[model samples]
Target: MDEELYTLIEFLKKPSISATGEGIDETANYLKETVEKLLGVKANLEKTKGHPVVYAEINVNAKKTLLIYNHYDVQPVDPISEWKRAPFSATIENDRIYARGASDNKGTLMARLFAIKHLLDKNELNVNVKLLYEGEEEIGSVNLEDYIEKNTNKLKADSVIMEGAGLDPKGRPQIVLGVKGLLYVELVLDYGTKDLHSSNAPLVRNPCIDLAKIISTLVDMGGRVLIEGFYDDVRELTEEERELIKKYDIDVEELKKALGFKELKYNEKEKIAEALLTYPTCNVDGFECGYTGKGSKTIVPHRAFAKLDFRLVPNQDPYKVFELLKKHLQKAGFNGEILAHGFEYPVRTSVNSTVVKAMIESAKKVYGTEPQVIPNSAGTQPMGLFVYKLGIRDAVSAIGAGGYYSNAHAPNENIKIDDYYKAIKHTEEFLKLYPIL
Candidate 1:
């Protein structure tokens, strides 16, 4: 193996699944030790309510400071039988490294760190770099907002470069200027104090049936959200934003075929790209009640529950959305109790920000083609905390790995060996020419 690839493989071998507290402390200590050895920079681990945030700063005599944001946390690996190799074991096969968190964040995150190390070794860095690697990104970054608020001075940066996200479907390097926000909640229904016999189902209320009816009413047949004033705060896209969307022609037919659908239901009514990128949505992640095993139980479930996630567009407050959801359930005459869970406000950086332009130029320099400037990503992150609480003005999202499929967040998650090297090379080149000002 090449030296860089060997380094990355060693890094990946250390499992850093943040959700279950597996290897988090060990990983944080490893990063701190590695940074000190390579760059002569001593980093500190700040303890939060949950996991710790590892931070390090190199104060070059430059006016501009660029904050590099990434999460060391990774999702838990379930259904281990689906993998050819152990999920925690970094297995190399066919020029690819198979491991959990290989491409999701660990590989890309380490690429940036090594890039900084290279610059420091060669004395090529001209900009001050601040590193913030958190451990709770897999959850919801619940404590991140307050953490930023408390450490404003130490965490301040003129611009921010985030980890995760990659090229769009069209093979162009994706440059996301902003990200949508998220609000996750659960709805619970109670029919009676205890489960009842199925024979008395007619006289007794059924929580499972009530849950289905409530969910149906929450969204229309066309998938439009039925909550009142849900769209009140959604900001309209500017002409420039619309022009950017027009540049990338999404293959709607191919998408339908790949998803095993004859045709999209709302294709005629709304553009697919617009609906996915610009509009808000409500989706049911899971629903559960009684027995879901092989046999049928003849008892009515005493309670039923459904987990719901609402993706909010810009200017949509998560608190208000929660209120609207509660009001809607009350109006539906269902005694469903709403329990609040993960929530983050939507964030958007100016598309015309200088940091964004620099990232685009750097990507073009490395890839030899102009990247598609995405005004916002369909997925949501806890970036609102940085934008709203810390007053950060600019942020960009990009990744280095190649190939179309890595099966991220799924069984057999892997990253190509060549793609891993390419990502590291891209990071080195980006840092080499990055205009700190």
Candidate 2:
């Protein structure tokens, strides 16, 4: 194996599962050490409440500075049985590297790093580079906001290249303008200290039933959140965003068929794009109250727990939404413990940003095609902190090695090796053009 790919596989070998706090510290240290070795300069480990941020820089006293944001942590691989290859093995097959973080982030980070190396080797890197890699992106970037706010001066840059994006279904590179915010919470209801016999079902209240009723009140059948003031803070869509939605080509039927869904909330293409980019969602990720171990057990479960996530669009504050939820639950007389997992604020970069323009030109130069432009992704990332904190108005998510079917955060996550090389070349081109633009 070549040293470049081997090094990436080595990084992938670490089980840096952020959700479960597995190998987080080790992975952060490894990244810090690797950057120090690669650039021959010290890399600082910025401590946070949960995980550390690896801060490194390559300064050539240039006229422009570009901050690269990525995460070393990856999503947890729960269903190990479904994976064709081990999640952490970084297996190679059919010219693709199959691993948990291959496409989501680790691969993208390595490609950009290699791009920087190429630029430095040829003495063509004109822009200052700053690397801000976190280890808790999968867990909602709980501490990232505080870290960025505290170290604003130290991390300032003219523009930012966010962690994740890739080619669309048609193989055209995608330039994502921004990401939605996230509020992940777990609700727990406990009726008794221990399980109770089912014989007393008439007199005793079932926590599971009560929890279900509470969840039902949170969202209406039409998919609108019932909480008061939920939509008060939503930023209205602009003309440019509307135009982007028009250009956002998507076959709703094909998407439904591929995902095995009989129907979606919005069937039309423009509605789907608008809903995904602008609308907020209240979804139950998982729910558990009772257990069926092959047969029936005549006992009421002691507790009920459910995991929920609300994807907030631009201008909707997650903390305010959480407060509204609490108020609504209290008014509805539903008593349950709401534990906050994490929260992120929504953000959107201007479509006409110089950084985005440079990225588009570079992508066109490298791929020989017009890049698919997205106003904002439905997914959540911590890009808001940089945009809102450091005043970096041009932060955006650009091309990566991942394909549309990369199965990110799934059982068989992988990235095409050819796409990886293209990502390196694409980043190099962007770096070369950004300083001049």
Candidate 3:
């Protein structure tokens, strides 16, 4: 086994679940120590409102500075009984390492670190490198906004390579130009003093039904938001952008089987890639108003609430959508409180940017094929803060170490061992090529 890969397994073995603040402090210390010892970079943990962000850097006195971003924090390993191996065991089976955080970001982090170390040792690294690793990415990077804002001086860079990109179902390499923004909010309604018998059929105001009515008005049967100004700010895609979408193909049938869904949403005329890449969405993540356990408890529950999120596109402001939601509920004759827990704005980088060009060229050199380039993936990430607020021009999600069945944030998460090496080699080529570009 490669020595660097062995160390990555040990890194995975440490429990660093940020959702519950478990093993965060110890993991932060480990990251700091490892970056200094292995990569020969000066490392420190800068305190945030919640967990601290691990910052590391190596200066080669180059003209351009490259910002490498990733997160050490992982999702909570719930339903632990379903895991074939212990969640933190970091066990290797069938040429893969199985554990939480093994695929989502840890695997990619270790691979990049190894790449940096390899090039630095050979005196082949020409660009200055800076790293910003967070402990709360799974929780929506709650404190990173302020951290980045406060340390803008250190974060200024010519380009940024984001954490990772997931492989397609066929295990082919993928690259992303941007990521979708997110607005995670919760609605709480209080209507009655206590739980009432189902017999109160005639007069009681059911908060569950009331909130449902409000929720129903938010999205239509066509799976589009009906908010008054929702579409006003969506950035229109160009013909050039359409050409980029045609570069990749999605195996919808294979994805349907993997997702265990009867069918996918959107019209047959609408391309799945089109909706996934440049569309806005409103989805009810969960609703909790009635009894969910055991057999049955008949009651007209006194309290009800729902958790929802709107996936916004470029130029759509999350704060504007949040305000529109409050006003919409007010006009709809419902009085429920709303709170925002997670927020991110949409962002995209131009293909002509140095970072994107370097990534595209490096992926081709490493894989012997042109990488699949998409405008923006259908997921939420805090890269917007760096792009819009911190003022980094070119940012791309270039390489990942995870495959299609990594099961990230789910039971039995794992990454193929060979993919980790691929990621390392890809990163090595990128670092060697980026400085010249």
Candidate 4:
């Protein structure tokens, strides 16, 4: 195996699940030591309230600086019985590496690091490189905003390359120029002080029923958010953006089949992609109320809990949205208590940025196809921390896990060996050809 491959395999062997704090410090220390050895530069581990962040810099007195933003943390691997191999074993089979973080972020992060190493070895680096690898991404990155706020000057960069989300079908690289903001909250509805026997059901008010009614009214069957002024601050897509969407020849049927959907609601074929990339949405992630056990228990639970998340477009503040949700609930006469969780504002970088152009060119050169450049990614990240706190505007995301079948964040997550190496090569070429502007 190649040296880069050997290094990556070794890195994947270490369990770095940040959510459960398993091997977090060890993995972070390993990363720092590896960077120091590869780049001949010192790396520092900055501790936060949560896990620490690994920071490294290679200064070249260049006019521009490129910051690579990534997370070293992997999600917790539960239901280990479902895996073909151990989740942390990093087993190589069928020309793929089967592991938890193999493709999600470890692969992408290694690709960038190897790219930098290749540049340093070849004496081809012209611009400065700074790396910020955090460990709290899987748990909402609660401390990242404050960290950036405190270390603005030290983390300044002309452009940032974030973790690109999963790819689309057809193996063409996808570029995400921005990401949606997120608001996670929980609602608790209470009726009586204690659980009531089902025998008194006629006289008791059911909190589960009340919670269900509230959830139902929040969205229609067609999936439109009913919150007042929810869409008021949403940034509309430009004509150029619409034109770009027209150029994408997505295989909608294949997507539906992959998702196991019998049919789509409304004009999903025409609107779903755009809506996911650029619109705001409210979703009920989960709810718990009555008894949930092996057998049915005949009792009326005193309380119900519903967990929700709102994906906001650019210009929609998450805090403001939470306030709006609370007011709406009160106006609707729903008796519930709201609990706020992680909240981050939306972020968008210009599609016309020079960094975006370089990434598109790099993708075309590597994949032999022009990449579809979405104005924003459907998922949320702590990108707003960099944009709002550090004032770094130019950002783009592109990753090397060959298309949507990577099975990220699920059991048996794997990346093809050939695809992994191709990504490494692409990263090398990007470092060589990406001009600093």
Error of 3 at 219 (Å): 1.1
For model 4 the TM-score comes to 0.95
> Could you give candidate 1's per-residue lDDT for residues 1-437 as a string of tens digits?
65567766776788777777899888888777766776788888888888889899988777778888888777888877888899978898988889888877788887777778788888888789999989888888877877888899988888888774655566567788778878898989887888888999888888898899999998887888999889889988888878776765577666777678766755532377677788888999999997788887898989999999999988999988999888888888878678886678877677677777766777777767778776788887777777777788787777656334677778888887766766776777776656553
lDDT for every model?
0.79, 0.89, 0.87, 0.82
Clashes of 2: 0
Ranked by lDDT, top first: 2, 3, 4, 1
Q: Write down the lDDT that model 1 would get.
A: 0.79
Model 2, 60-160: lDDT tens digits are 99989999999999999988999888999999999999999999899999989888888888889999999999998888888888888888888888999
Per-residue lDDT of 207 in model 2: 88
Clashes of each: 0, 0, 0, 0
Alpha-carbon shift of residue 309 in model 2 (angstroms): 1.0
Which parts of model 2 are misplaced by more than 4 Å? none
lDDT agreement of model 2 with the native:
0.89
Candidate 3 local lDDT, 1-437, one digit each (tens): 77888899989999999989999999999999999998876899899999988998889899989999999999999888898999999999999999999888899999999999999999988999999999999999999998998899978898898887867776667888888999998988888779898788577888889889889999889888988889999978877778888766777777677778787884333387888888898999988896789798888888899999999998999999898877887888868788896789998878888788888888888777668888888898888988999888789997888978899868999998888998999999999888888
Candidate 1 displacement at residue 276 in angstroms: 1.4
Which ranges of candidate 1 are over 4 A from the true structure? 260-263, 266-270
Q: What TM-score against the true fold does each predicted structure earn?
A: 0.94, 0.95, 0.97, 0.95
The residue-by-residue lDDT of candidate 4 on 1-437, one tens digit each, is: 98777888888888888878999999999999998988899999998988999999999787778888888899888988898899988788898888889887898888788888888888888878889999988888988877777888898888888876545677778888778899999999888788988899998789998888888878878788988888888867778777665665557778777778777653455576675576688899999988887987899899999999999887999999998898889877789788986798888788878777777877788778778777777788888887777788888787565457777888888888878877877776676666654
